[PDB]
Each structure stands twice: as C-alpha cells, then as structure tokens.
Amino acid sequence: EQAWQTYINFELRYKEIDRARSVYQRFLHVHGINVQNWIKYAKFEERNGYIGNARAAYEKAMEYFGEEDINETVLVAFALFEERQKEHERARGIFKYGLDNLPSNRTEEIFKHYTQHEKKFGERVGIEDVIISKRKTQYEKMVEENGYNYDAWFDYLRLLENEETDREEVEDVYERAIANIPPHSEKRYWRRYIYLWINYALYEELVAKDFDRARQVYKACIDIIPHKTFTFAKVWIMFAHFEIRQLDLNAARKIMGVAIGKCPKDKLFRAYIDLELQL
Amino acid sequence: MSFVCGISGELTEDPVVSQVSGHIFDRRLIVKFIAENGTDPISHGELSEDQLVSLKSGGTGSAPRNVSGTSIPSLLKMLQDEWDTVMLNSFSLRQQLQIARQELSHSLYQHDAACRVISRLSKELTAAREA
Amino acid sequence: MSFVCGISGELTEDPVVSQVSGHIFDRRLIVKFIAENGTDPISHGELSEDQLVSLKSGGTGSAPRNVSGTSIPSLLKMLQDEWDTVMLNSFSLRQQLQI
Amino acid sequence: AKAQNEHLLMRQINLELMDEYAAESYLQRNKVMEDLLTHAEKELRKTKEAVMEVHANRKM
Amino acid sequence: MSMKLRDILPAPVAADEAASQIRRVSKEPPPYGK
C-alpha cells in the first residue's frame, strides 16, 4: 500500500488529479480489502470536489464489502460524508439503516456518531429518542456483563417506566431482573436486590393497574426469600396492606398471620398490631 | 456465434445445451465442470455427458431469418397485449362504476329528507303561530 | 436471450431443440410438424415430441413499434399488408420450385 | 364516433410512451442488427476461403 | 442481493453540476506521384 501512495502523491504534486484518480481505481483492485483505502479514495474525490464520485465511491464500497456482511466503518464514513455535504436526511438514513441491519454488539460507533449527527442536526424529539435507544442498549450490555449489577436494572427499569414504554416490555425486563437471585444466604446481599421485587409489584399495582398480576408478584417474593435464615418484614407488610386495599382483610390477616407463624419478627408484630388498631 | 454462454458470458463457438438445465454452455467449459463437479452450474442438478446436445444453424431448408422488424407473430403479439390492457382497464372502470353506482343508490334519501323538512317546518309554523 | 426458429425464421418466445438435430424451433411449429411427419424437419431423423429439450432462458424481446403501429386500426392495416406479402412469398416459392 | 374516440386515446398513450422509449429501443435494435451483419460477413468471408481452398486442392 | 442503499436512501437533494455532474500537429507529404 505504501508504494501506491507515493505514486498518488507523485501525481498530486503535479496536480494531475485524473491521473491520481486512476491510481486509486487500480489501487482498490489490489488492496481493496482494506476499508481505509476505500475511504481514502472517497476523501480524495470529496476534497477535490468530485462529490458525485465520492458518493459513488462510498456506494460502491458498500456493494464491494457486501450489503449482508455490512461494514460499520463504511456506514459511519459514508453517513458523516453526507452530513458534511448537508445531505442530512441521507446521513440520518445511513445511520438508521446501520442500526436496523447490524447486531448491537457492533454499532457502538454508528450509535455515537448517530447521536452526534442527530444531536446537532436533528431535533428534540429525535435527539431524545436516539439517546434513550443508546441508553437501553448500554444498560442491556452492562447487564450482560454481570447480571448482578442491580444498579443497571434499577436504572433500566426506571428509564423504561419513565419513557412510558409498553407494559409487556417493562414486565419482561423485570422478569430478567428477578432471575438474578443473590447467591448468598445472608440478608446483606438481599437488601439491595429485594427492591427489584417491590418495584415490580408497585409497577404492577400503580402503573399497569392489574392487581391480580400484582398479587402474583408479591406471592413470588415469599416463595423466594428463605424465611428460616432471614426475612424481610417489608414484603410481608406490603403484601398485607395490598390485601387491605381491595377490601380483603380476611386475606391480609392470613398473610400477616403466616408471617408471625414462619418468622416472629418485631416489625411484623408491630405492623400487624397497628393494622388491627386502625381497623 | 449468436449463442452467449450462461457461465463464461462469451459469445460461444461451441454451443451446447444440457437437458436438466435448459441452458446454454460452452462445450469446453461444461465437460470439465462435469469432470470436476458432476453438477449443473445453474440448477445444481446432476449432469452426465449423454444429457448434452450441441446447437447448429443453417442446415438445408432452414428459413432465412426475418429482419424486417414487422412479422405476423409480433403483430398478433402486440394486438394481444393491447387487448389485455384494454380489458384490465375496462375491468377497473367497471369496478369504479359499480362502487359509484352502488353508493348513489344507497344515498337516495332525498325524498325522505324532504318529508322531514315538511314535518319540521309545519311544526315550526304551529309553534311560531300560537301567540 | 434471442433465438430464431429454423422453420419460420421468426423470433420465438418458446425456443426448443430436438435431441436429433442441432437446430432450434418454436415449440408449436415443430410439434405440428411432428404431428404430420414424425421426423426432424432438417435432418429427417425420426423424432417424437418427448425428444425435445426446452430452453428456459428468456425469449427474444419484442420488436419495437413503428410509429404507424401506434394505433389498433393501423396495426390491422399493417397486419393486412404484412399478410399479403407473406402469401405472395409463399406463392413465389411454389413457382420457383416448378422452374 | 365513440369507437374512434378510444382508438385515438390509446394512440395518444402509445405515442407518449413511444416518445419516452422509441429512441432507446431503436438504438438497441440497430446494435443487435449490426452484430448480425458483421457475424454474417464473418460467415461469408469464411466460406469464400473454403471455396477457394477447394480450387487450390483441385489445381494441385 | 440485499435491498440496496441505492434504493433505500433518499435521492440527494443538494445536486449541483460541478458537485456531481462534472465527473470523469504535423505536415503530411503530398500523395503518390503528385
């Protein structure tokens, strides 16, 4: 490659642009496999103002590397070219086509440049849409990196709730959160984890307003907590008061009495006593 | 020759057609492809040398090629293509007419609207003229 | 692709080849020939309708219209004048064969 | 008079399409026809030499 | 082949002639005899 560059530079020093063009078109027949040679040609055609050739050069690059085995570096370079030619609807097009056709383990460059292009040349409803989709992808990555990064879940759940995303998808991601049961019998590790369950029930009761499903959430808490080694009074109190709502004290008493039965604990007694005083 | 090979893309001088492919090859190409791979390049069906026939032209009785551009087949062909266009055109017009003719029959309220105006205005008159 | 029938000399939309000759035909013509004579029209080898190999490659493109061929009555007029020249040709052949 | 009205309409549609594509298709037609002429002249020249070769083998 | 960017993308609206349309003696002797 370094040899062909010196021939290009030779012709350019005599301002023989059409000669230097012909060297590139031969150069890509030999060293075409290196994407940077293909981008350098389109930068050359662009910098000499042959913008129709520069566009065709990028379009041929996509064709060469294959529009099934899509290459991010061409897409980014091509998109940033159209952006710099003020073909912003094409620039946006190229970024969106990239995200639509590539797996999200790549595309981090397409994303960051798309949330550069849109963040300048877009508009608020577009700027926030791409940043959310970036963040969802970013949380989804750092969840796959660990699973037990509960703060990634608490953000991810909050984000999806805040953006009013569809119930099935917010409910699904909660189920993925919940599968990260702490590998310990010690309450210290559960103290952070357990608010995934509590927030899931709060979401199901307040936002989805599907109380039968909310009951199943609370029930599934009690099937997961060990109870013999430790207990959370939090979940028993909340599940009792959830059955005081819907006017089912005959269930709330059963829930709270089993809490006393399995695991006498001072806040459980206090909270049950206080409930019976208020009744 | 006027035959173009499907695989090499050249105008061949050794035209051969294979029964499974229904396609035209160079003899020198297809025999080695059969030798190395035993397979039709187009359909990926099996091939063997007995499935191959070689094309010829200009034998005794072979009619002169018509080059005048007009012909009875081609005129009957384009008269047929006119006819198909006019019928599918006429069919969509007939469909359009049926839709328009259907709804304007359903829309024939106008005499019953007139009776409602008569009923409303006569009520109005008796309600206007009572003082 | 483009093909011409050995019998008619016209382009053909259904090119076919006999297994007993190199020459190619429009299917309905060679079938009608076989239905009379049971033989290859050029090699005179005995031929049957199943010994025909069909080129699935696309037939010859349509002949462009003449400007006079842009109207249906003028196509019929053109078809009439075309037909008369075809019959005079066929009549000229039987005279030439006698001579 | 109704029948001629539609023939003239279809004529106009044909002529307008013909104005888009006749120039290309006639050019394409000639490019095919040219090939036949050169290939026919190739066959003519090839057979002339073969007739001449037979005169050679006869004289020899 | 896949659905091309040739087909999916909007046509370029900033088209311009120079941008995308400006692409890329001797004597003889007199004849024989004369």
């Binding site: 027949h29 075409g32 065709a56 060469y64 | - | 349509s62 | 594509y21 | -």
Partner: peptide, 24 residues
C-alpha cells in the same frame, strides 16, 4: 410488458457508469 427493455436501458446506464469507476 411492451417496453420491458428498460431493464437494458438501466443496465447500459449502469455499465456506462462503471467507466472511470472502482472494482467489483
């Protein structure tokens, strides 16, 4: 159905645009 040769117009336009243009 009649002017189906427009495929040959775009192909010859495409082939023409391969002049002074890249590999493959």
């Amino acid at each position: 159905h009649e002017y189906g040769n427009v495929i040959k117009k775009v192909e010859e336009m495409k082939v023409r645009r391969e002049n002074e243009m890249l590999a493959l």
